[PDB]
Amino acid sequence: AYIPNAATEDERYYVPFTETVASRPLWISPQQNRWCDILLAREAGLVNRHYHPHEVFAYTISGKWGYLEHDWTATRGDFVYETPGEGHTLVAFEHEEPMRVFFIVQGPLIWLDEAGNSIGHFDVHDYIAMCREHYEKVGLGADLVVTLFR
Amino acid sequence: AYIPNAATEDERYYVPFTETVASRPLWISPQQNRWCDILLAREAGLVNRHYHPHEVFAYTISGKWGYLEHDWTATRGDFVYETPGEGHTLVAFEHEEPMRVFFIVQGPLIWLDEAGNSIGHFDVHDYIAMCREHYEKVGLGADLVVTLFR
Ligand SMILES: [Fe+3]
Ligand SMILES: [Fe+3]
């Protein structure tokens, strides 16, 4: 698979995930419960506390972001590996550029509690569904998502 | 793990792989036989034909490169997924910028024949050895490699 201009300026390609953060799917494996994507926050953003059962890798393209549970913040060019089992809250700061991050995500995400409990999930089927749905609405066609399968 | 400025200009961090192509290790898993790295070619470059038993993901940072066995060439911003089992020859063109590519590699690589045979291998132990060795020589210390383990 070859996707030119992955972190495109074309807003249509980005699927809302939370209210402030969206992603462009690049590669999805329903069988492996795994996906690559560009994570985008045009403004201040937050992704709720969750943990992955497995690793996460990120390479930062632009903006400034990090997780509240570590001391670093990542800007253009910085690499991040999250250790499996880590509960974390992603945040994005307002920077000259939107936040854009290349991610390889081995799902599910388990949403965590204010407390510390499992309170919801996000797996690859949830991801395929939201992306198909958005791509139908914006006129990229639901079937463009199917093009990303492997 | 957080590595600032992964695709650094500091040449010392890059470990020669072929004569024209080098990589900076970013994350290495001896147990999973898997690693992330920045692949760099300052000039024209070539990596000999080989196949991975598993997937490869790449996000292109700068330069222009591709595989002889596909029709695309990848420049700044382009994403690539190589399907597992694919035999391929990586090439890098001379561009305004060096080639720099963020890779997640599930090894081993099996070197292939002019013909089409398995004729050599490259696994994570080979990678750890070459990186330790180079990092000792350049004065980043062999032990900096151990810092990359997970
Ligand atoms: Fe996460
Ligand atoms: Fe390869």
Residue numbers in the entry:
A (entry chain A), B (entry chain A): 27 to 176
Task: Quote the study on this structure.
The enzyme 2,4′-dihydroxyacetophenone dioxygenase (DAD) catalyses the conversion of 2,4′-dihydroxyaceto­phenone (2,4′-DHAP), a breakdown product of lignin, to 4-hydroxy­benzoic acid and formic acid with the incorporation of molecular oxygen. Whilst the vast majority of dioxygenases cleave within the aromatic ring, DAD is very unusual in that it is involved in C—C bond cleavage in a substituent of the aromatic ring. There is evidence that the enzyme is a homotetramer of subunits and its sequence suggests that it belongs to the cupin family of dioxygenases, which have β-sheet structures and are known to play key biological roles in metabolism, biosynthesis, oxygen sensing and DNA repair.
The structure refined at 2.2 Å resolution establishes that the enzyme adopts a cupin fold forming tightly associated dimers with a pronounced hydrophobic interface between the monomers. Interestingly, in DAD both of the sheets are actually six-stranded owing to additional β-hairpins formed by residues 40–55 at the N-terminal end and residues 135–148 at the C-terminal end of the cupin motif. Whilst the electron density is visible right up to the C-terminus, the first 26 amino acids at the N-terminal end of the protein are not defined by the electron-density map at all, suggesting that they are either disordered or have been removed by the chymotrypsin that was essential for crystallization. One important and intriguing feature of the dimerization interface is that residues 28–30 form a very short region of β-strand (strand N0) which takes part in the dimer-forming β-sheet of the cupin barrel of the adjacent subunit. The catalytic iron is bound at one end of this hollow by three histidine residues (His76, His78 and His114) and what appears to be a carbonate moiety bound to the iron. Instead, carbonate does fit well, has a high natural abundance and is known to be a metal ligand in a number of nonhaem iron proteins such as transferrin and lactoferrin as well as a substitute ligand in some dioxygenase mutants.
